[model samples]
Target: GHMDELFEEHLEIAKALFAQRLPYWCDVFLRPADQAFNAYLNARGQASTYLVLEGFDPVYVPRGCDLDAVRATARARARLREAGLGEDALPVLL
Candidate 1:
């Protein structure tokens, strides 16, 4: 996806993740912010792989969570919204 179309949204997600202390997993292929997140992830000596999501799936969005998790998702979704995702469009990581 075009970064320009999602930058602001990314920022929003970053903020939420930061608040919840949820690590941002960069996609191995796209690795949008891999360099940056990798540095952060590696500080903790973690390794991860990136995967491509070809289609929108509702299952990705978590159905229920604790307040903290919900806050994280809301933060991520807000970031997506800021990035110009359609009002009805949402990203979920089940």
Candidate 2:
């Protein structure tokens, strides 16, 4: 699927972003709690959308994250929601 390719590419981009200290969502082995709840909004439907926080670079969101990371995650989640994706496009956060 095009979305699968896009999502995988985005994951690579995310890895590079982390290495370069840029802002992007981290690829995960386990789905985050909120993502699990909103399983319908998968990456496929929303992969082409520009996440709001993608504009911000060098942003760090730690594990057991607080409000700020949650906010960014939420924005991304909302984008997925708007795109109307299902769980298939979503990746689990490790």
Candidate 3:
């Protein structure tokens, strides 16, 4: 349980860091994805570890992952929401 608490603290810290520099779309797209995936893993009710790791230390960017695509998708979604056309839109990985 100690590790779980530590991981949770890390997640919180990561969130704060993201909020400081990233647009709200980063929160909209990434945070919920992290939470949902982690929740799915937790619901399995087995001894396993799942983390939505990001940033510099222990960096994890999947091979061939197009971060520009991610940013474009987030920007589009944000624009739609701003226009009141996608207020309930969920983030889509690109």
Runs off by more than 4 Å, candidate 1: 28-33, 36-94
- Writing each residue's lDDT as its tens digit, candidate 3 over 1-94 gives 7646644554554344333432222232244454543453345332223223232112112224345655565566656666776444645444
Tell me, what's the RMSD of every candidate?
Answer: 10.0, 12.7, 12.2
In model 1, how large is the Cα lDDT of residue 69? 52
Measured by TM-score, the strongest candidate is 3
Query: What TM-score do all the candidates reach, one by one?
Result: 0.29, 0.29, 0.31
Off by over 4 Å in 2: 25-94
Writing each residue's lDDT as its tens digit, candidate 1 over 18-91 gives 45544343232144454444333334334322222322211111112243453455566667867889635654
- The lDDT of model 3 is 0.40
C-alpha positional error of residue 7 in candidate 1 after TM-score superposition, expressed in Å = 2.4
lDDT values for all models: 0.40, 0.39, 0.40
Model 2 per-residue lDDT tens digits across residues 15-89: 454444343443332334224312222342322222224422122232233435445555665467568865445
